[PDB]
Design a binder for this molecule. Structure first.
Ligand SMILES: [K+]
Ligand SMILES: [K+]
Ligand SMILES: [K+]
Ligand SMILES: [K+]
Ligand SMILES: [K+]
Ligand SMILES: [K+]
Ligand SMILES: [K+]
Ligand SMILES: [K+]
Ligand SMILES: [Mg+2]
Ligand SMILES: [Mg+2]
Ligand SMILES: [Mg+2]
Ligand SMILES: [Mg+2]
Ligand SMILES: [Mg+2]
Ligand SMILES: [Mg+2]
Ligand SMILES: [Mg+2]
Ligand SMILES: [Mg+2]
Ligand SMILES: [Mg+2]
Ligand SMILES: [Mg+2]
Ligand SMILES: [Mg+2]
Ligand SMILES: [Mg+2]
Ligand SMILES: [Mg+2]
Ligand SMILES: [Mg+2]
Ligand SMILES: [Mg+2]
Ligand SMILES: [Mg+2]
Ligand SMILES: [Mg+2]
Ligand SMILES: [Mg+2]
Ligand SMILES: [Mg+2]
Ligand SMILES: [Mg+2]
Ligand SMILES: [Mg+2]
Ligand SMILES: [Mg+2]
Ligand SMILES: [Mg+2]
Ligand SMILES: [Mg+2]
Ligand SMILES: [Mg+2]
Ligand SMILES: [Mg+2]
Ligand SMILES: [Mg+2]
Ligand SMILES: [Mg+2]
Ligand code: NA
Ligand code: NA
Ligand code: NA
Ligand code: NA
Lengths: 122, 129, 208, 218, 89, 103, 71, 32
RNA sequence: GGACAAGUCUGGUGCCAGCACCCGCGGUAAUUCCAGCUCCAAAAGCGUAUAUUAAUGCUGUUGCUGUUAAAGGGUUCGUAGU
RNA sequence: AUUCUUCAAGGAUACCUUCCUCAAUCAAGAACCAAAGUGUGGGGAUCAAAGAUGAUUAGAGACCAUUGUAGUCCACACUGCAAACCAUGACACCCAUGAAUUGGGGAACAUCAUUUUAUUUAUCAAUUUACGUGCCUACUCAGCACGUUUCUUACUUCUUCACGCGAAAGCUUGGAGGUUACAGUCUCAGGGGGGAGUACGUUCGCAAGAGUGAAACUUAAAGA
């Protein structure tokens, strides 16, 4: 079998997090970078770490990966999410008119507020 | 069949207080039941209760304030001489500092502390604390 | 709710009723439990349960008055394992100043004292008693009261203050948290009651 | 070398919460045995080991032997604690039992038999504790009649501070582990019984964790 | 004045436990499900003033699922929750 | 030690006195009807290969007319239902699944 | 579960009389049968004449000769 | 097996063995 | 040795002789036998046997147990009794 | 446990009918009681104790195969021995939750017929009572089912059932709960394991058997 152990997988995630820029989808250039920024002794381990890092870069180019959490990608994601529409969704729904049921109408008619405006049965 | 109205009523009250209820319904009622409840109420263990009339043996609704730990009847109604109060207190009461044993005497139904003051014996009915 | 002098403030207005109806916050499920049966006001022909709007508002204000009495807002934590509520609790904690826990609840967060993520809240708010069952069970070991948003089929063990509402639906959850945040700020001096709040409810919506 | 990890520990480490009664009032759990060490004066804790026996688990090629130890702790009057732990060595099990005993510490109520002259000397009411098949019953006794109990419960009652009691037992009391726990449960129950002297309402108070909210949030 | 007293006016109890506001039962020191809830008072304007109302719940009520019903009863009795909706003007 | 609350059959107390026995489909052992393991089996008369070859020769089933089937209600004794792997022993806290219907 | 009757003294007395024969300790002291089978006539000691010296082997886990006598 | 240790032969067959013993005693006493 | 207060002492014997109310000890290093020296209990007293009371909520009125440990009659009717 | 025709019963439900403690449980006593078994007449297809033959096996008086008598079935008399079990005595009270089900009734469908108040309120509400479908004379019918909401009786389930209890397995409106905080009423059994449900005596039975029921001795455990 060719399963990568947890020592290899943990190191590869750390390298991609710290040196995402200057890494690409080529094993041979990624290997030179890995040897530069890794202190470990085994040459076999460093080859496996470069291999799994190249695998992650290929995955990242098509979609997010659950364990990476890049800073720049996260910041742009937050900015996109915090979008404020011109008109609130609740305001647009009220202006369109609200339809209720007979049971809901009966409950509203017995309250101190009464049936509010923009409320029609059907 | 039901053989003791007093025992049935005291079991309903003790069961309800164990479950932490606020009110309990008792059926059927009787003169002895009402007198027993009046002794408990005078010492502050139950509170207000009401009797409903139905042209038969009535019904009682009792309000509970959460101060009653246990009540129960004693069957059969053993005779108690005026010098035997300490024996019953030692046997069926948590301590000598609180709790009452209810007796029926020729002067009426009363707790054991009042009976000692009037120097009368009788027959043991029950207890509460 | 009521106050010491019957000032008739804090009562729900026409606009608040409109927001609840527009977001379908009054629509329950078809099932029903014994504990939740007192909050149900009628049932539609389809089988849906209608929640009593008056009871929903009274419980919501009671929850707000409990939260507003905590000196340190970090002593209140909001939890949610449902996907639709993770965004809402994030915005809620940002506005009010509380802590939050989204996703899977790690067991032992409130009981294992030697871990690095040990937490000791004073008040707990959860989105769903059924899915947030682990948080409620832990709160019953370390003396923590619980506020919960409940649907018509929810179990009420370890729940202290239940707010009956629609627990499912991205719009319904967001509106309930938006209403609770606005009331807590109003009970403080932060925002006035005479001017509509400028924060849009769409910020609380869950987005992919 | 103690670094508290709970809000209660930080309050006790500073000179706040000067008594165990503050903790007992609000039912807070105790998760650091250094709290009890600080809140009870030196020369009064008075712990002792009650029972240590081996337990075995069958394995392929033999069995594994461990040691379970029981410990009792308690000041002169009103406090008692019992703990039991397992370890690979007798010394390791004994040390772990002392910590467990301190963590589970409860107050004991005391009262009078007939006349309230000097000081509480007996238990106020009849109590019963049950663990396994063992049930232990404690009955108030008059002054002078001392601790009428078997050697195992007698040692626990002395540490709790009780002076006069009658004792009854039922079940298989030769199981010393259940005998020790049943006595502890009976003494725990003394503060859960509502008597007419406690009817007169109560006054609310703030918990330590919010009275000192500003100090903790640091 | 709560507690047991000597022949002279000396209180000889270690401490006085809390009582549940719903069941009038003592709250022990080994009961870790008991809770205390504080509700803030509100000025004529919707702003808290600094005082609170405190409720104590036994703890076995919480385990059995009756704490929500009990708190409802207590809040109505204390004058915090309105029992029913108002009438139309 | 009581293994099952219903004791392996479908006869509650205070419901019946006696249930008539039936013969096991395999060994002819007599077993009460409510205790036996019963299955309703619908079997095709021919497999796919043989059915195709018969249909070419037949003028009736040659154009979209169903071939007949075999219907049987088989009741097993407990020993025969286990040895034939109709049922198997199940873990505790799993013995309580019921499967009221097919599949 | 017993009567508890207040006029059922006869039933309780009869119940205890019948059930007291079920323990060996009470029955042995009240039956006069063990006394007749006892070589001593209910006494603590007796005198006799020695007939033979015998050796009795010990029970299985032990192993010895016990040096008894026939009287 | 559905029963705990009997400590002997099967109780049904032990009962039958005593069953046959009682007949032989009855016949032997009949001869006198 | 334990229950049960008091020796990981020194010789002899070697599943023998013996001890041991019960659990158990004795086949070559016996904490138990036969002895020496020390030590323990209570003491002008102290062992052993048999009977009896308490231990015993193992006869249970106060106060037992009856699904699986011993123990609910195969089912109804029914008199005395309660 | 097929259908039809008959005979006498039984429970539940409905009722502004009648009566007025007439009841609960029970030594003695009575009736009924699976299969096997017994007696006298019928009947005899199937299966099949005993027996026979063939295999298998070291052996095989067994399991497998082919047979085969009594029995298995009916009528009239006996017997009274079951893991006759829910291994759980009868009567009475309280008791949390969600889905179902068997019988009866009410609402609905169908058929006929033609309270004050209340401008200034609220602490335990003065009316949540809502809702449709299919079949149906060119009559066991003003009928039959279904859908929705209540009620009384019965057998149950929770794998999305609460206290409490128990040595535990487990029980839980139907308790094994409401019990050292030990008392609703009556009755039947048990007191370490064996010897033994044996011996002797006596009652019942055609027999087979059934009921009642010891001791001498022997054991440190047996059991859950
Ligand atoms: K089955
Ligand atoms: K087996
Ligand atoms: K030697
Ligand atoms: K017993
Ligand atoms: K015959
Ligand atoms: K055959
Ligand atoms: K029998
Ligand atoms: K029926
Ligand atoms: Mg004892
Ligand atoms: Mg039936
Ligand atoms: Mg049967
Ligand atoms: Mg088995
Ligand atoms: Mg058995
Ligand atoms: Mg010795
Ligand atoms: Mg010693
Ligand atoms: Mg002796
Ligand atoms: Mg030596
Ligand atoms: Mg004696
Ligand atoms: Mg005694
Ligand atoms: Mg048995
Ligand atoms: Mg029976
Ligand atoms: Mg048929
Ligand atoms: Mg027959
Ligand atoms: Mg014939
Ligand atoms: Mg035969
Ligand atoms: Mg054969
Ligand atoms: Mg044949
Ligand atoms: Mg026949
Ligand atoms: Mg039986
Ligand atoms: Mg038991
Ligand atoms: Mg039992
Ligand atoms: Mg009793
Ligand atoms: Mg015996
Ligand atoms: Mg004869
Ligand atoms: Mg014959
Ligand atoms: Mg016989
Ligand atoms: Na005795
Ligand atoms: Na046959
Ligand atoms: Na059975
Ligand atoms: Na149930």
């Amino acid at each position: 079998g060719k399963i990568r152990t947890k020592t290899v997988k943990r190191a590869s995630k750390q390298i991609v997090e710290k040196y995402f820029s200057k890494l690409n989808k080529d094993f041979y250039q990624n290997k030179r970078i890995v040897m530069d920024v890794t202190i470990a002794r085994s040459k076999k381990l460093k080859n496996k770490i470069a291999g799994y890092a190249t695998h992650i870069m290929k995955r990242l180019a098509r979609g997010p990966v659950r364990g990476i959490s890049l800073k720049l990608q996260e910041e742009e994601r937050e900015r996109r999410m915090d979008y404020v529409p011109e008109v609130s969704h609740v305001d647009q729904a009220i202006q369109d008119g609200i339809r209720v049921d007979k049971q809901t109408l009966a409950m509203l008619k017995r309250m101190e507020t009464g049936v509010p405006r923009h409320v029609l049965p059907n | 069949t039901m053989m003791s109205v007093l025992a049935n009523a005291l079991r309903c009250i003790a069961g309800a207080e164990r479950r932490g209820k606020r009110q309990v319904l008792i059926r059927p009622s009787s003169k002895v039941v009402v007198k027993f409840l009046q002794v408990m109420q005078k010492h502050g263990y139950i509170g207000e209760f009401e009797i409903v009339d139905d042209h038969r043996a009535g019904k009682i609704v009792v309000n509970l304030n959460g101060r009653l730990n246990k009540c129960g009847a004693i069957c059969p109604r053993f005779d108690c001489t005026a010098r035997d109060f300490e024996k019953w207190v030692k046997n069926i009461l948590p301590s000598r500092q609180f709790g009452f044993v209810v007796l029926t005497t020729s002067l009426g139904i009363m707790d054991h502390e009042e009976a000692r003051a009037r120097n009368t014996g009788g027959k043991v009915l029950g207890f509460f604390y | 709710t009521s106050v010491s002098s019957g000032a008739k403030v804090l009562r729900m207005k026409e606009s608040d009723v409109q927001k609840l109806l527009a977001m379908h916050c009054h629509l329950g499920t078809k099932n029903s439990s014994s504990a939740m049966k007192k909050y149900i006001h009628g049932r539609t022909s389809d089988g849906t349960n209608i929640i009593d709007i008056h009871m929903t508002w009274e419980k919501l204000i009671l929850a707000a008055r409990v939260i507003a009495a905590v000196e340190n807002p970090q002593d209140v934590t909001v939890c949610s394992t449902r996907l639709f509520g993770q965004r809402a609790i994030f915005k809620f904690s940002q506005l009010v100043g509380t802590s939050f826990l989204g996703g899977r609840f790690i067991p032992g967060t409130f009981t294992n004292q030697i871990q690095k993520k040990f937490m000791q809240p004073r008040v707990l708010v959860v989105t769903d008693p059924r899915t947030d069952h682990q948080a409620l069970r832990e709160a019953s070991l370390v003396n923590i009261p619980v506020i919960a948003f409940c649907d018509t089929d929810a179990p009420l063990e370890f729940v202290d203050i239940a707010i009956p509402c629609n627990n499912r639906g991205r719009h319904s959850i967001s509106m309930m948290y938006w209403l609770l945040a606005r009331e807590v700020l109003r009970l403080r001096g932060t925002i006035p009651r005479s001017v509509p709040w400028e924060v849009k409810v769409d910020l609380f919506f869950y987005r992919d | 070398e103690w670094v508290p990890c709970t809000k209660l520990g930080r309050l006790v480490k500073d000179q706040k919460i000067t008594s165990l009664e503050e903790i007992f009032l609000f039912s807070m759990p105790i998760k650091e045995h250094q709290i009890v060490d600080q809140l009870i004066r030196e020369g009064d804790l008075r712990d002792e080991m009650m029972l240590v026996f081996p337990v075995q688990k069958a394995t392929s090629a033999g069995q594994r032997t461990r040691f379970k130890a029981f410990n009792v702790v308690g000041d002169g009057n009103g406090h008692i604690g019992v703990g039991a732990r397992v370890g690979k060595e007798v010394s390791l099990a004994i040390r772990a039992s002392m910590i467990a005993a301190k963590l589970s510490i409860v107050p004991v109520r005391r009262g009078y038999w007939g006349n309230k002259i000097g000081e509480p000397h007996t238990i106020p009411i009849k109590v019963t504790g049950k663990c396994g098949s063992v049930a232990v019953r404690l009955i108030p006794a008059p002054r002078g009649a001392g601790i009428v109990a078997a050697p195992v419960p007698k040692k626990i009652l002395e540490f709790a501070g009780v002076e006069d009691v009658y004792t009854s037992s039922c079940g298989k009391t030769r199981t010393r582990g259940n005998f020790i726990m049943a006595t502890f449960y009976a003494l725990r129950k003394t503060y859960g019984f509502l008597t007419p002297d406690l009817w007169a309402e109560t006054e609310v108070s703030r918990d330590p964790t919010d009275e000192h909210s500003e100090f903790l949030s640091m | 004045t709560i507690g047991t007293y000597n022949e002279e006016g000396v209180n000889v109890d270690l401490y006085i436990p809390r009582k549940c506001h719903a069941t009038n039962s003592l709250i022990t020191s080994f009961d870790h499900s008991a809770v205390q809830i504080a509700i803030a008072n509100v000025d004529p304007n919707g702003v808290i003033d600094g005082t609170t109302t405190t409720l104590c719940i036994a703890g076995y009520l919480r385990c059995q699922g009756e704490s929500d019903h009990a708190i409802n009863h207590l809040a109505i009795a204390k004058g915090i929750v309105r029992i029913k909706t108002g009438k139309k003007p | 030690t009581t293994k099952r609350r219903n004791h392996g059959r479908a006869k509650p107390p205070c419901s019946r006195g006696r249930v008539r026995p039936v013969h096991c489909f395999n060994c002819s052992r007599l077993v009460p009807k409510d205790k036996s393991v019963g299955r309703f089996v619908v079997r095709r008369m021919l497999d796919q290969a043989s059915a195709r070859d018969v249909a070419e020769a037949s003028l009736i089933y040659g154009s979209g007319f169903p071939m007949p089937k075999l219907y049987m209600k088989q009741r097993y004794c407990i020993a025969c239902a286990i040895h034939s792997r109709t049922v198997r022993a199940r873990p505790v806290e799993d013995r309580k699944r019921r499967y009221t219907s097919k599949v | 579960t017993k009567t508890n009757g207040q006029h059922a003294a006869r039933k309780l007395v009869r119940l205890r009389r019948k059930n007291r024969w079920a323990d060996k300790g009470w029955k042995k002291s009240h039956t006069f049968v063990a006394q007749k089978a006892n070589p001593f006539g209910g006494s603590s000691h007796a005198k006799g004449i020695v007939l033979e010296k015998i050796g009795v082997g010990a029970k299985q886990p032990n192993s010895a000769i016990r040096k008894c006598v026939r009287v | 097996g559905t029963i705990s240790r009997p400590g002997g032969m099967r109780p049904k067959w032990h009962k039958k063995r005593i069953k046959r013993l009682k007949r032989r005693r009855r016949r032997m006493r009949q001869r006198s």
